[PDB]
C-alpha cells in the first residue's frame, strides 16, 4: 500500500517538476535562459545545446547577452539562435552575442499558448498513468487479500486526492504560462 502510494507521489512530483521546465522552454516576452535550451549546434560531431556552450545573461527585460565559453564557437551559436524558432535576430561585438527579443505578434502568441497547453496535456496524461499504475497495484493488493478492504479504500481515496493535487498544479503552471504569453 505504502510503497505504491509513496512512489506514486514521488513520481507525480518529478512529473510536475518536468512540466515546469518544459514550459520554461517556451518563447515569451521577458526573455529567459529556458527558451535557448532547445537550440543546438554541431559541437565536434555531436549536437550540443548552447545552454551548455555559453553563459546566457538577461540584463534589461527584452535584451539578452550571451558569452560563448570558447570564442570561436560564437558564429555557430549565433547562427543557431538566428535559425531557431525564437523569431530573433542576434548581433555581436566580436566576443558577446547580443540578442534583442522583439514583441510577439498576437498572431504568434496564440500559437505559443497552444504549445503551453499541449505540454500541460502531456504531463497530466503522465500523472494519470502514474496513478493508474499505483491504482492497479492497489487493486492487486485487495484481490490477493494482502490488506484490509477499508485499508485499500483509504489508500484509493488518498491516491485520487494526490493525483488531483498534481493535475491542478500542472494546470496552474500552464495558466501562469498562458498569462506570461499574453503580457
Swiss-Prot record:
**GO biological-process terms attached to the record:** translational termination
Keyword Protein biosynthesis present in the record's keywords: the answer is: yes
> What GO MF annotations does this protein's record show?
ribosomal large subunit binding
Its Gene Ontology cellular component terms are: cytoplasm
Supply the alphabetized keyword list.
Cytoplasm, Protein biosynthesis
Region listing for Disordered, in residue ranges = 143-163
Q: Where mainly found?
A: cytoplasm
The record's listing under Pfam families reads: RRF
Per the record, the similarity remark reads: Belongs to the RRF family.
The record's section on PANTHER family has: MITOCHONDRIAL RIBOSOME RECYCLING FACTOR PSEUDO 1 (PTHR20982:SF3), RIBOSOME RECYCLING FACTOR (PTHR20982)
Q: What does this protein do?
A: Responsible for the release of ribosomes from messenger RNA at the termination of protein biosynthesis. May increase the efficiency of translation by recycling ribosomes from one round of translation to another.
**Protein name in the entry:** Ribosome-recycling factor
- Write down the species: Mycobacterium tuberculosis (strain CDC 1551 / Oshkosh)
